[PDB]
Design an enzyme around this catalytic site. Structure first.
Site, short mmCIF file in Angstrom:
data_model
loop_
_atom_site.label_atom_id
_atom_site.label_comp_id
_atom_site.label_asym_id
_atom_site.label_seq_id
_atom_site.Cartn_x
_atom_site.Cartn_y
_atom_site.Cartn_z
CG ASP A 56 -1.89 1.15 1.19
OD1 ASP A 56 -2.86 1.07 0.41
OD2 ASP A 56 -1.65 2.15 1.92
CE1 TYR A 73 2.33 9.30 4.95
CE2 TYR A 73 0.95 8.10 3.38
CZ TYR A 73 1.11 8.74 4.61
OH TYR A 73 0.06 8.83 5.51
CE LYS A 89 -3.97 4.65 0.04
NZ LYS A 89 -2.63 4.36 0.60
CG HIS A 114 -4.58 9.62 0.08
ND1 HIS A 114 -3.21 9.50 0.00
CD2 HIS A 114 -4.93 9.16 1.31
CE1 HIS A 114 -2.75 8.98 1.12
NE2 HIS A 114 -3.77 8.76 1.93
N1 LIG Z 1 -5.66 8.25 4.60
C1 LIG Z 1 -5.12 6.94 4.23
O1 LIG Z 1 -5.47 6.33 3.24
C2 LIG Z 1 -4.10 6.31 5.19
C3 LIG Z 1 -3.84 6.91 6.38
C4 LIG Z 1 -2.96 6.34 7.24
C5 LIG Z 1 -2.32 5.16 6.91
N2 LIG Z 1 -2.57 4.54 5.72
C6 LIG Z 1 -1.89 3.30 5.35
O2 LIG Z 1 -1.97 2.10 6.47
C7 LIG Z 1 -0.83 2.00 7.14
C8 LIG Z 1 -1.13 1.97 8.69
O3 LIG Z 1 -1.14 3.24 9.29
P1 LIG Z 1 -0.55 3.52 10.82
O4 LIG Z 1 0.94 3.40 10.90
O5 LIG Z 1 -0.93 4.92 11.20
O6 LIG Z 1 -1.19 2.49 11.94
P2 LIG Z 1 -0.84 0.88 12.22
O7 LIG Z 1 -0.65 0.04 10.99
O8 LIG Z 1 -2.07 0.41 12.94
O9 LIG Z 1 0.53 0.69 13.13
C9 LIG Z 1 1.18 1.83 13.59
C10 LIG Z 1 2.41 1.50 14.49
O10 LIG Z 1 2.26 0.39 15.15
C11 LIG Z 1 3.76 -0.17 15.37
N3 LIG Z 1 3.68 -1.61 15.14
C12 LIG Z 1 3.55 -2.29 13.98
N4 LIG Z 1 3.53 -3.58 14.23
C13 LIG Z 1 3.63 -3.75 15.55
C14 LIG Z 1 3.64 -4.90 16.30
N5 LIG Z 1 3.59 -6.33 16.03
N6 LIG Z 1 3.76 -4.82 17.62
C15 LIG Z 1 3.85 -3.59 18.20
N7 LIG Z 1 3.83 -2.45 17.45
C16 LIG Z 1 3.72 -2.54 16.11
C17 LIG Z 1 4.60 0.30 14.46
O11 LIG Z 1 5.83 1.08 14.89
P3 LIG Z 1 7.29 0.93 14.08
O12 LIG Z 1 7.13 1.53 12.72
O13 LIG Z 1 8.42 1.63 14.80
O14 LIG Z 1 7.67 -0.52 13.93
C18 LIG Z 1 3.67 1.23 13.64
O15 LIG Z 1 4.32 2.39 13.43
C19 LIG Z 1 0.01 3.18 6.57
O16 LIG Z 1 1.29 2.82 6.36
C20 LIG Z 1 -0.60 3.52 5.18
O17 LIG Z 1 -0.03 2.71 4.05
C21 LIG Z 1 -3.45 5.12 4.86
#
Ligand SMILES: NC(=O)c1ccc[n+]([C@@H]2O[C@H](COP(=O)([O-])OP(=O)(O)OC[C@H]3O[C@@H](n4cnc5c(N)ncnc54)[C@H](OP(=O)(O)O)[C@@H]3O)[C@@H](O)[C@H]2O)c1
Length: 326
Positions: free
Chosen positions: A52, A57, A87, A120
């Site tokens: 994704d 970014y 996106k 997006h």
């Molecule tokens: N508007 C949109 O369309 C939109 C918005 C936001 C995000 N997204 C997409 O979805 C993804 C998720 O977003 P998000 O980072 O905000 O939330 P997330 O996937 O729920 O996870 C966020 C944080 O959780 C930590 N983490 C990951 N795996 C873990 C595990 N097993 N155990 C403990 N901690 C863990 C990580 O830190 P570390 O990085 O230090 O390992 C990560 O930074 C984004 O990368 C993006 O591609 C899309």
């Protein structure tokens, strides 16, 4: 390794395209040069087949090298085995800018097509001559209200890219129920995906239900909730005792329980990490027992929803109209 992992599971979009149930979130809002390459490479090696990405970014170039290097190193795998999503950002909703954005993303990714292309945000903003976000006098996005309230021109452009086979499926992100109703009326190609925030602190059930009931498949960003730490209470999703109890009683990580909850509800989950150990671990998504599934739901249902991703203050535009009171 989890032989029974749901990383082998796919969903079927309303146009027949198959999307892996688990995708790797590539957002790297804090550097560095080279970190997106390493993380993406790690995800591909760990068994992710769904990546994704987003123009926003500004790291699709590193992703492109990671895909290319992975494919060169593993002749048995074909680009067609990968599901690549990108996106178009808010300042590029004009029809010609939508096509330019995909062309630019395709160039950086070193691909001829993407598997999924998303608008997006349902917000159109003005752009500079050099295709950056134009800032108004308050420092916020300058909103194009005509294109925001009547997104048809923007969607036509996605439809044309789809018919040009530059995207195998087109979809939306952060769309609301009413937004979907408005799009369905003017759309010739129904969006295949609505990528939204979904986790136990924001179950988003009414929108998830409406999408499923309408042939739009949700995908969850921030499926782990972020470590962003709920602002009005100072609690973290990953510190939640109820969530941790379900994971601990079943010898699985908290993250795996949250990802398994999402797929079990019937939607894609897009965990992000930069840490190899976490990239590897998050691809091991269990098929949750009925008791585990229900108890996670108990946590979600026992609290007030909290949306972690709301760019109100940056956009100068309030999509979800949420307040302290009311
Ligand atoms: N508007 C949109 O369309 C939109 C918005 C936001 C995000 N997204 C997409 O979805 C993804 C998720 O977003 P998000 O980072 O905000 O939330 P997330 O996937 O729920 O996870 C966020 C944080 O959780 C930590 N983490 C990951 N795996 C873990 C595990 N097993 N155990 C403990 N901690 C863990 C990580 O830190 P570390 O990085 O230090 O390992 C990560 O930074 C984004 O990368 C993006 O591609 C899309």
């Amino acid at each position: 390794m989890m032989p029974a992992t749901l990383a082998n599971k796919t969903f079927k979009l309303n146009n027949g395209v198959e999307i892996p149930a688990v995708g790797f979130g590539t957002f790297a809002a804090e550097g560095q040069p080279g970190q997106t390459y390493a993380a993406t490479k790690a995800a591909l090696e760990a068994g992710y087949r769904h990546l994704d990405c987003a123009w926003f970014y500004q790291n699709e170039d590193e992703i492109g090298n990671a895909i290319a290097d992975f494919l060169k190193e593993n002749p048995s795998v074909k680009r067609e085995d990968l599901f690549i999503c990108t996106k178009v950002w808010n300042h590029m909703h004009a029809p010609e800018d939508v096509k330019w954005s995909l062309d630019n993303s395709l160039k950086a990714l070193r691909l001829d097509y993407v598997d999924l292309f998303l608008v997006h945000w349902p917000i159109a903003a003005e752009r500079t001559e050099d295709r950056q976000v134009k800032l108004g006098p308050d420092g916020k996005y300058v909103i194009n209200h005509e294109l925001t309230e009547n997104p048809e021109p923007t969607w036509r452009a996605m439809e044309e890219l789809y018919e040009a086979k530059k995207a195998r499926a087109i979809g939306v992100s952060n769309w609301t129920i009413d937004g979907l109703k408005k799009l369905f009326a003017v759309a010739k190609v129904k969006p295949a995906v609505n990528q939204i925030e979904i986790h136990p602190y924001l179950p988003n059930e009414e929108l998830v239900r409406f999408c499923l009931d309408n042939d739009v498949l949700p995908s969850a960003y921030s499926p782990l909730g972020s470590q962003d730490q709920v602002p009005t209470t100072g609690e973290r999703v990953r510190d939640d005792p109820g969530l941790n109890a379900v994971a601990n009683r079943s010898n699985m990580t908290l993250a795996q329980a949250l990802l398994g909850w999402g797929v079990k509800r019937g939607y894609v989950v897009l965990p992000k990490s930069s840490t190899p150990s976490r990239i590897k671990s998050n691809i091991e998504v269990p098929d949750l027992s009925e008791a585990d599934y229900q108890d996670l739901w108990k946590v979600a249902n026992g609290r007030k929803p909290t949306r972690f991703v709301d760019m109100k203050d940056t956009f100068g535009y309030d999509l979800w109209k949420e307040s302290q009171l009311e």
